[PDB]
Design a binder for this molecule. Structure first.
Ligand SMILES: *[C@@H]1O[C@H](CO)[C@@H](O)[C@H](O)[C@H]1NC(C)=O
Ligand SMILES: *[C@@H]1O[C@H](CO)[C@@H](O)[C@H](O)[C@H]1NC(C)=O
Lengths: 218, 220, 214, 178, 104, 656, 220
């Protein structure tokens, strides 16, 4: 078969600047002057979108900033004015021989200004407590620097190994991340403690920001 | 404009069979080459087969030569994929693609998840996430719903009757120690509303056939 | 119709040669082509002597020859023998009448040794006497020319009676041979003295006489 | 009130010209001695264009292709072309297509997509004095009855049939491969 | 009686007598003996044989091309030559020795 | 230096001897060479080579001998028919068409076969069988596929010989000849060849023979298989004019099916070529076989009209030439008799007299119609036929035949770069357009589907009606209750292909208003009246002195009527909202006065298009138009529109 | 190579008569056979000609539609039928053989048949003995003979005592009287003493009248 290697597995480019992705084929996919090498964009939660077909041809319905190029064994994809909502995954594909193999992929990040995270905490309701389990959640939304930490406190009790984090991809608008931290427990261990707290550390926060709540308090 | 949608495939066990129908609309189906591709979480996209229009001369990849069978029916305008001797390697999101000139996948489908886990299907968990009053009512809020301890086949999570475009987040599902997944939907509605605009995030699970609208109301 | 012309009188002395001819029109086709000459003989069935102007068949002698046709043609007989004097005919192909045949030429040889007529005259028989018819048969013998006149007498010069005369041809090796026959007298022939035939040859007369005698 | 009008009559013409009754046959006709007309045909030899050949590139126009079979996409050109002049007429129709010679395997499908009155130029040809080939190669059992050099097919065709005068106007079948 | 034909050269001017056989004489062979003039003894007549069918056809053609000025003699010639041409068959001559009368 | 020869035949045992004198015989027979035929006969040819040359010729199998009966074409002399010598044509015999007349056959035949040449060449295919013949002949020669397939048909008054010769691309050439005539009159054969071995067809007196080699016969049999039996039957049993008309219809079908642009090497085409040759031979031999008598002038005209039409058509299509079968005496006689009748009042005579006059017009004036006044004759034959014809009805057989005979000079004049009969040709074309309705088109399509005489000619071929696309035609096509549907489709295809502008470049390239329009493809109808001429199109860019627009439905193409004043165009359209066509509801049905003569009437439909066109000429046409079943005011889509000579358009919708 | 006519005799005017002609000693189907007649004591004239296998036949203008030829196969006989005979047909008819290849002359002839066309009937000849005179002398001669008289059909053959003598002429060519009948005389000359040793008798035969007579010739 033909192996495609994408040189930039990860790439962060400031909004309005130029992003460039490379793709290399094992053998030449160009025959009789036509280069069978297309570029696709996949958004998380959506099917892949056709960006460029053949070496340089822009598919109708795509902004002119997406520009494919290259020949023989080396191909490139350029976004001279990158924009918000352009952040997604990018693949290169060959159609020269019979089995078409895609590329390794490339995730695009938008270098925006540092945003302060908004932290919220939600306790269980009556519909969950009678089941036999309990789960307190903490939302960390609208922050760009993805590197951050969150730590739960069960009335000032560290419980490592029973809390799960989940990060959303870079949002389409404003390009801000969100993180859900869930802390589970049994129904016999929720009414035992009062002030559940969440302490998070982020680059946009000079001081570690904590938010707390008390059980069954008006 | 071209519309490709795949059938809602559920769960099968190793060594099973599940016919996969991908329906097309908006164009002539008997003129284009069709293709079956797959995407596994953590593997990328991988082509598995293709078929020419009407002529019916199918070509698969090497690893899936005798494993898959692709058929076509232009009278019903549907492309068919059939599984056989399934294993843990081909658990993925299957896509039906429509090849254009030079045979690039011009139009993709919605995709159908396929998993080969011996564990049977089970119901999810349903409860909301209350606004909380520690936030000042200055037009910003935070609430939603939480769906945890389930199998990774569905996310039919759309908040408040599809009239929400601001702050609507659907977190990815993370595997649990028990062998399940968990996530939540959160929304930042204007705190000026609160009342009246108190309807529910719609959470639906396709295999178990469960639509859910568990009321999201604040505690007093 | 359209018969060809040839002279009837032809004569030649013994030992030499004689030429006969039969003129024609388109039957002689200008250039000599296909003319024949046959001999007839008394009472015979003809024999081809010459054919194709001047060609001789097997068995015939070289005495006979053919001449150039032109428009008249000719047959030359050299060394006239004894069996040569006879009737000679000529024949030709005619584009109009298929075959055109000859009129006939009576060739006679003149150089013949003379012979004396041995005349014999017979009287009427008893059967003729009882039948009321009386004929006198006076038959001659060998002579030289075919023309031999005969005068018949009762006592002296009677004429315009039942005289019947002929001039037959040659007999077997007898040269000009003989003639015969004469008058038919009624029942009363004994009323006259006698009856004689005076044959006349070459300037001489020879008579034979008979009379009724019982 | 309306105005009456006369009946429409034919426009007036001129009297016939004076007939030339005092002309001889040698003036009215030619030299009387005639030579029966003969023609010398300017026979030209056929050569492969060489520069026009099978496109090693692979393509298929799904928008306006006539019909597909196996990995072959077939177009019937809208404009009619001469058989020899069609090698180029398809090198310019679509990208990566050329004049194709149908084999016994593709031939019935070609004759099926055809009306009962029209015909088509095909890519079977003979250069020398035998071995009919196409731009893909191989041999063809052409129903040869004329001067060869070129072939064509109709609705009821079983084998490519040679044409007498290949300066005519017929569409051409052309292929794109994979 | 018979002859053989090979292809020294005598023109039509020196031809005087031609002889055409019948359908029963020399098998079914149409043969023609052409003989020069006979005038003279210093001058011998030369006889050469030829294809009787071709001679008969030549004379039929000549007589037909002059039918307007033809006597009853030549008319009879035409009729008898036409019936003579139809008396010989060019077929039933294939397996026959086309050199039947060449004695070498 | 030739003398005499003695022939000797020892037949049946009996020896016959004949003599041939070459002297005097050659003196009283011109052009005869005995030594030439002696050399050509190959007298010294051995039996082996003679048999080899014999087997090199395709010998056919013995046919049965089909019994046929020749017709009676040439009649007896009609009472005091003044016999005319073609060599001396005095202008005192022009006692009109009513006086019987005949032309002497000997000088006429000498004029037809005035040319003389060789017809049995010294080429290989014919040298084996035929003695080289040189005689008075007339030939029809054609060459197609770029001199790659030639057909030459030579003919005397006794026999015809056609010859196909195809030159393959490799360089080889295949020749095949067909000789038709009387068995007694066939040319003289060479060598051991007889005619029963070569006869393909034979009646009581006539014979059709094929001459070719076995190899050439196989190569021709590959792509040429003629029905020689039916060929010979039609050649013998038909008359001269009937056979010429049959070959004419065959050539018309060939011009429709594929056309002479790309001549096919099908059996039908070669059969049609040999049948053209036979059609000329059937007049030549018929004139030459009557025996020094005289042939009627009516028969002569009726046959030579068809002959001239065939010659013109084969010259237009295949560029074929016809040397012979002309007779300048017949041309002088016809041109003299033409000056005895008024061409403007030609249509007032009897139909037989009209056909006679048109026959003589085509015969005496064949040179592309330099004397254009003949057009005014044909127009008078059409105009007089227009006023006495039931409107919007198919043309009767007699009328169709008369107009077909009359339209030949119009076809001839329409192919000229210039023509002094502008308005006369315009009136002829306008009457032809007004005659073409739906029922006429249906009859033409029926005749073309079956192949009868109806589809041979119709005025719509010369009509100024351009809107006849496919859909309109097979909607106007007859309901094929007992017809072949594919035949109706082919008939529509041929009908629309004959009407093409690319067809021989006729139509109206010299019409003065033809240059006013720009988008000529959007034109639907042209109407040339006396003063102004109207153009009906679907484009507002007509470039006239006015611009009207009739009522029509949405989506359907618009109907734009634009007049042209005195055949002189303007600058460019009207550059304004098109005029409204004034309606006439204040009109009375009874009109004893001829107040509409010289106008035009258009019945059209808003959804479909134009239905009927009518040049309203005499009082009879106006009458039949007015108070009749023609005026229906039921359908709201059908409208009746009137066009005047003043360039004013009206729409009539009221009658009381 | 003998060639014999036969079949002739006396016939009435306007009647019919069929002459035969037998030939042998040669191939009779290779040569053409002609009939040629000769009036008595007059020239020869050609009558008719038949070819091999009776292909084309020729008649002179003197016979036209009155005489017809006939032939048979192999060495059989030739025939001539005569219908509506006239006086000019009185002649001796020969059937001769034409020559071979490219020859225009006659080969062999036949003896011929006498055909007499006359209204006169047949009459038997009367015989009368011409007796000698018994004169006493040494040798000399004897007027011995007999006379046959008054008969119309020409041929008559006499022989003395059945032709046992070769010396002395036995015939004199008959005369043609003015009435039309014939008469000849047989006069053999025997010496005078040859009387009682052998009596003389002349047998006369007239076949066309069927009359055979023999009478004594001994004198009184
Ligand atoms: C023909 O005959 C003439 C006789 O005058 C002779 O001179 C000549 O040589 C002969 N041959 C030819 C070929 O003329
Ligand atoms: C005549 O026949 C001979 C015999 O083979 C041949 O060589 C020659 O070419 C022939 N000539 C003609 C004119 O046919």
């Amino acid at each position: 078969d033909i192996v495609l290697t994408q040189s930039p597995a990860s790439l962060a480019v400031s909004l309005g600047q130029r992003a460039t992705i490379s793709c290399r084929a094992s053998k030449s996919v160009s025959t009789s002057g036509y280069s069978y090498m297309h570029w696709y964009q996949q958004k998380p939660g959506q099917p892949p979108k056709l960006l460029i077909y053949l070496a340089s041809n822009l598919e109708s319905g795509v902004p002119a900033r997406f520009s494919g190029s290259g020949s023989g064994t080396d191909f490139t994809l350029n976004i001279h004015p990158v924009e918000e909502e352009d952040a997604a995954t990018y693949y290169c594909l060959h159609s020269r021989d019979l089995p078409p193999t895609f590329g390794g992929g490339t995730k695009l990040e938008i270098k925006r200004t540092v945003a302060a995270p908004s932290v919220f905490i939600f306790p269980p309701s009556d519909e969950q407590l009678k089941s036999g389990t309990a789960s307190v959640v903490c939302l960390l939304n609208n922050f760009y620097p993805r590197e951050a930490k969150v730590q739960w406190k069960v009335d000032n009790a560290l419980q490592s190994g029973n809390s799960q984090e989940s990060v959303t991809e870079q949002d389409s608008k404003d390009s801000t991340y969100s993180l859900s931290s869930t802390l589970t427990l049994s129904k016999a261990d929720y009414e035992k403690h009062k002030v559940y707290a969440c302490e998070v550390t982020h680059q946009g926060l000079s001081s570690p920001v904590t938010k707390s709540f008390n059980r069954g308090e008006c | 404009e071209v519309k490709l949608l795949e059938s809602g495939g559920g769960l099968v066990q190793p060594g099973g069979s599940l016919k996969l129908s991908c329906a097309a609309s908006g164009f002539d189906f008997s003129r284009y080459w069709m293709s079956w591709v797959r995407q596994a979480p953590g593997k990328g996209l991988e082509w598995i087969g293709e078929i020419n229009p009407d002529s019916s001369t199918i070509n698969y990849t090497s690893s899936l030569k005798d494993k898959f069978i692709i058929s076509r029916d232009n009278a019903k305008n549907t492309l068919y994929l059939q599984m056989s001797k399934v294993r843990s390697e081909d658990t993925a999101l299957y896509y039906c693609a429509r090849q254009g000139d030079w045979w690039y996948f011009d139009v993709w489908g919605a995709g159908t998840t396929v998993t080969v886990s011996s564990a049977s299907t089970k119901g999810p968990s349903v409860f909301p996430l209350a606004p909380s009053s520690k936030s000042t009512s200055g037009g910003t809020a935070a609430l939603g719903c939480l769906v945890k301890d389930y199998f990774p086949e569905p996310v039919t999570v759309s908040w408040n009757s599809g009239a929400l475009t601001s702050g609507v987040h659907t977190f990815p599902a993370v595997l649990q120690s028990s062998g399940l997944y968990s996530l939540s939907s959160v929304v930042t509605v204007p705190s000026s509303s609160l009342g009246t605009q108190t309807y529910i995030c719609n959470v639906n699970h396709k295999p178990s056939n469960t639509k859910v609208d568990k009321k999201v109301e604040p505690k007093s | 119709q359209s018969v060809l012309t040839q002279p009837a009188s032809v004569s030649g002395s013994l030992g030499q040669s004689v030429t006969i001819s039969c003129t024609g029109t388109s039957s002689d086709v200008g250039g000599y082509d296909y003319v024949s000459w046959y001999q007839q003989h008394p009472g015979k069935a003809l024999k081809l002597m010459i054919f194709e102007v001047n060609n001789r068949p097997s068995g015939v002698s070289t005495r006979f020859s053919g001449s150039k046709s032109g428009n008249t043609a000719s047959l030359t007989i050299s060394g006239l023998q004894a069996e040569d004097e006879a009737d000679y005919y000529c024949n030709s192909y005619s584009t109009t009448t298929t075959w055109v045949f000859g009129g006939g030429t009576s060739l006679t040889v003149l150089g013949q040794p003379k012979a004396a007529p041995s005349v014999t005259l017979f009287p009427p028989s008893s059967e003729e006497l009882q039948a009321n018819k009386a004929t006198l048969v006076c038959l001659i013998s060998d002579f030289y020319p075919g023309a031999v006149t005969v005068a018949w007498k009762a006592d002296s010069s009677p004429v315009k009676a039942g005289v019947e005369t002929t001039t037959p041809s040659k007999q077997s090796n007898n040269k000009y041979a003989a003639s015969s026959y004469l008058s038919l007298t009624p029942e009363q022939w004994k009323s006259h003295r006698s009856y004689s035939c005076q044959v006349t040859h070459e300037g001489s007369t020879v008579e034979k006489t008979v009379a009724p005698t019982e | 009130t309306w105005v009456p009008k006369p009946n429409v009559e034919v426009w007036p013409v001129d009297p016939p010209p004076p007939v030339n009754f005092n002309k001889t046959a040698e003036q009215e006709y030619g030299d009387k001695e005639v030579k029966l007309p003969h023609w010398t045909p300017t026979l030209h030899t056929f050569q492969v264009p060489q520069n026009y050949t099978k496109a090693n590139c692979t393509y298929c126009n799904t928008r306006e292709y006539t019909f597909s079979y196996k990995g072959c996409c077939f177009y019937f050109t809208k404009k009619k072309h001469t058989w020899n002049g069609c090698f180029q007429a398809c090198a310019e129709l679509y990208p990566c297509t050329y004049f194709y010679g149908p084999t016994p395997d593709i031939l019935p499908v070609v004759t099926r997509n055809l009306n009962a009155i029209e015909s088509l130029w095909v890519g079977v040809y003979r250069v020398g004095e035998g071995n009919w080939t196409s731009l893909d190669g191989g041999t063809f059992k052409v129903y040869q009855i004329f001067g060869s050099h070129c072939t064509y097919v109709s609705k009821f065709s079983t084998v490519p049939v040679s044409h007498h005068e290949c300066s005519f106007l017929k569409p051409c079948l052309c292929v794109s491969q994979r | 009686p018979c002859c053989h034909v090979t292809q020294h050269l005598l023109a039509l001017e020196n031809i005087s007598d031609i002889y055409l056989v019948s359908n029963q004489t020399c098998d079914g062979f149409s043969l023609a003996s052409l003989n020069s003039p006979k005038n003279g003894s210093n001058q011998l007549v030369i006889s050469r044989c030829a294809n009787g069918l071709n001679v008969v056809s030549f004379f039929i053609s000549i007589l037909k091309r002059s039918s307007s000025a033809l006597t009853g003699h030549l008319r009879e010639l035409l009729t008898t030559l036409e019936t003579l041409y139809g008396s010989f068959s060019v077929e039933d001559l294939f397996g026959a020795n086309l050199n039947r009368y060449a004695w070498h | 230096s030739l003398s005499e020869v003695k022939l000797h035949l020892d037949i049946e045992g009996h020896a016959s001897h004949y003599t041939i004198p070459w002297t005097e015989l050659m003196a009283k027979v011109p052009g005869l060479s005995p030594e030439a035929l002696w050399r050509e006969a190959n007298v010294t040819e051995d039996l082996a080579s003679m048999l080899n040359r014999y087997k090199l010729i395709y010998k056919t199998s013995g046919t049965l001998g089909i019994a046929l009966a020749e017709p009676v074409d040439i009649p007896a002399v009609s009472e005091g028919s003044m016999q005319v010598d073609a060599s001396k044509v005095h202008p005192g015999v022009i006692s009109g068409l009513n006086s019987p007349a005949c032309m002497l056959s000997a000088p006429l035949e000498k004029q037809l076969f005035y040319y003389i040449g060789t017809m049995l060449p010294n080429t290989r295919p014919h040298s084996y069988v035929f003695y080289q013949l040189r005689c008075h002949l007339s030939y029809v020669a054609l060459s197609i596929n770029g001199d790659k397939f030639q057909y030459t048909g030579a003919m005397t008054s006794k026999f015809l010989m056609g010859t196909y010769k195809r030159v393959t691309e490799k360089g080889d050439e295949h020749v095949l000849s067909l000789v038709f005539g009387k068995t007694k009159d066939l040319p003289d054969l060479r060598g051991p060849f007889s005619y029963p071995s070569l006869t393909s067809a034979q009646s009581g007196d006539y014979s059709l023979v094929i001459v070719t080699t076995f190899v050439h016969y196989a190569n021709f049999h590959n792509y040429f298989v003629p029905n020689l039996k039916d060929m010979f039957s039609r050649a013998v049993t038909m008359t001269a004019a009937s056979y010429a008309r049959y070959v004419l219809q065959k050539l018309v079908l060939l011009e429709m099916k594929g056309g002479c642009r790309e001549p096919e090497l099908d059996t039908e085409t070669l059969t049609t070529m040999f049948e053209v040759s036979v059609a000329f031979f059937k007049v030549g031999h018929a004139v030459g076989e009557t025996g020094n008598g005289c042939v009627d002038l009516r028969w002569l005209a009726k046959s030579f009209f068809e002959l001239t039409v065939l010659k013109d058509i084969i010259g237009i299509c295949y560029g074929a030439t016809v040397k012979g079968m002309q007779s300048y005496g017949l041309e002088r006689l016809a041109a003299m008799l033409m000056a005895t009748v008024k061409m403007e009042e030609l249509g007032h005579l009897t139909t037989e007299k009209q056909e006679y006059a048109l026959r003589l017009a085509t015969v005496g004036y064949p040179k592309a119609g330099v004397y254009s006044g003949l057009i005014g004759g044909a127009t008078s034959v059409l105009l007089s036929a227009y006023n006495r014809h039931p409107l919007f009805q198919p043309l009767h057989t007699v009328m169709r035949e008369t107009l077909f005979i009359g339209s030949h000079v119009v076809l001839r004049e329409l192919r000229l770069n210039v023509t002094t009969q502008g308005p006369n040709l315009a009136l002829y074309q306008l009457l032809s357009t007004a005659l073409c309705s739906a029922l006429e088109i249906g009859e033409v399509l029926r005749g073309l589907a079956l192949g009868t005489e109806s589809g041979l000619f119709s005025p719509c071929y010369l009509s100024l009606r351009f809107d006849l696309t496919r859909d309109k035609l097979l909607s106007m096509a007859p309901q094929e209750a007992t017809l072949d549907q594919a035949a109706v489709s082919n008939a529509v295809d041929g009908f629309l292909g004959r009407l093409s502008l690319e067809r021989e470049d006729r139509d109206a390239w010299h019409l003065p208003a033809y240059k006013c329009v720009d988008r000529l493809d959007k034109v639907l109808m042209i109407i040339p009246l006396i003063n102004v001429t109207f153009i009906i199109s679907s484009d507002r860019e007509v470039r006239g002195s006015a611009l009207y627009e009739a009522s029509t439905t949405y989506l359907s193409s618009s109907l734009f009527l634009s007049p042209v004043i005195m055949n002189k165009c303007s600058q460019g359209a009207v550059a304004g909202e098109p005029r409204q066509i004034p309606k006439i509801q204040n009109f009375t049905r009874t009109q004893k006065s001829c107040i509409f003569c010289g106008f035009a009437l258009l019945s059209y439909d808003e959804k479909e298009g134009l239905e009927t066109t009518t040049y309203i000429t005499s009082q009879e046409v106006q009458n039949s138009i007015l108070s009749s079943n023609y005026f229906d005011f039921d359908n709201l889509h059908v409208h009746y529109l009137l066009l005047t000579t003043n360039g004013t358009v009206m729409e009539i919708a009221g009658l009381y």
